Structure 1
Amino acid sequence: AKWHLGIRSQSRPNDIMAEVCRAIKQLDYEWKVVNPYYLRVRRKNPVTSTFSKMSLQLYQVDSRTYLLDFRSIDDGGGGGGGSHTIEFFEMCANLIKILA
């Protein structure tokens, strides 16, 4: 099996952060802008009413390529009785979908 860290693009860093903000808004998650390249995002579970947080961080991996990093925030989220881990995976799959 070949596992990939987050996702990759060859758009401009600014362009990239633009689309993930749009993708985020579409989902109706709340987000905060720490760096121009670092986003904390928050989301309230419609079923469980809990909150889950995660970081989106953009790195440069190439001269032409950047990497968007997803990291769960271990802050006492989430479930539920859901599952902080599984709900993390779902927030991501949704964002990765809206992108693509």
Structure 2
Amino acid sequence: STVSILPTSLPQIHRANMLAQGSPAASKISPLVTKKSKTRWHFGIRSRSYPLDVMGEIYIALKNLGAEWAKPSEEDLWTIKLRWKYIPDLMKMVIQLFQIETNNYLVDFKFDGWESSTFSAYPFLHLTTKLIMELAVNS
């Protein structure tokens, strides 16, 4: 076949041909180097405080943002079943506190549907962004 890569299109040859001609830009302009850092992903947010303290910070943040929640029982103290105002108008969330290490806890956030296989998490993601920011300020 006669399918090829045009050699003069490759950066190394193009640069060299511009340098050989004499144009100053050849020395001064450098190629774009996009350093793509390996992003570390985590579920939810970590806290170094202790259970009752953490749960207290969350509820305070929830209250100031205008959310409502169900009364928890003794078997599910570390679970928040909340509703947020933001066609169904009220978004449901489940927030769960987990223990990692002795001094380390993870706050898990879960979308739980709407109240009046194919769905958008973006309204959920937007609200959690507000919640994480509200929490970061109070700290």
Q: Quickly name the TM-score band, shorter chain normalised.
A: 0.7 to 0.9
Say whether 1:22 aligns with 2:22: no
Q: How many residues align structurally?
A: 92
Deviation at 1:84, TM superposition (A): 4.7
Residues 32-43 of structure 1 correspond to what in structure 2 (within 5 A)? 32-34=70-72, 35-43=76-84
Q: Report Cα offsets for 1:11-67 as digits up to 9, x if no partner.
A: 11000000100000000111124322000110123xx76111011100001111000
Say whether 1:88 aligns with 2:124: yes
**Structure with greater strand share of residues:** 1
2 CA distance for matches of 1:50 and 1:84? 15
Query: 1:44: which partner in 2?
Result: 85
Counterpart amino acid of residue 8 in structure 1: R
2 CA distance for matches of 1:31 and 1:84? 23
Query: 2:9: which partner in 1?
Result: none
TM-score, structure 2 as length reference:
0.61
Query: Which structure is larger by alpha-carbon Rg, 1 or 2?
Result: 2
**Structure with greater helix share of residues:** 2
Q: Which one is further off, 29-38 or 87-96?
A: 29-38
2 CA distance for matches of 1:20 and 1:36? 13
Gaps of 5+ in 2: 1-38
Deviation at 1:90, TM superposition (A): 1.5
2 CA distance for matches of 1:41 and 1:94? 15
Q: What is the alpha-carbon root mean square deviation over aligned residues? A: 1.8
Gaps of 5+ in 1: none
